[PDB]
């Protein structure tokens, strides 16, 4: 009924969305990634920084990583 020992696994934590109900979201620690501009994705677009594309990676794109640092061209 709450986020009470609600272990939602790696790169996830527990929130409780807005019909009150307890849902493991995506919400990768950015304060464990050590470069901070921007991303160029796998999926060939820009993510504005590395969290953001590990965000999308959990939440649509298993396969999604970085291919190389700065803009994608």
Same mark, same amino acid.
């Not at 272990?7 to 109900?21: I, L, Q, T, V, Y």
């Given at each position: 009924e709450t986020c009470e020992n609600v272990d939602c696994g790696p790169g996830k934590?527990?929130?409780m969305?807005?019909?009150n109900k307890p849902r493991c979201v995506?919400? /990768?620690d950015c304060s464990n990634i050590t470069w901070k501009? /921007?991303?160029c994705g796998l999926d060939g677009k820009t993510y504005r920084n590395e969290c953001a594309l590990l965000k999308a990676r959990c939440k649509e794109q298993p396969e999604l990583e970085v291919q190389y640092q700065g803009k994608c061209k």
């Amino acid at each position: 009924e709450t986020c009470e020992n609600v272990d939602c696994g790696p790169g996830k934590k527990c929130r409780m969305n807005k019909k009150n109900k307890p849902r493991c979201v995506c919400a /990768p620690d950015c304060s464990n990634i050590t470069w901070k501009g /921007p991303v160029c994705g796998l999926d060939g677009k820009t993510y504005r920084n590395e969290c953001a594309l590990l965000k999308a990676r959990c939440k649509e794109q298993p396969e999604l990583e970085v291919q190389y640092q700065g803009k994608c061209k």
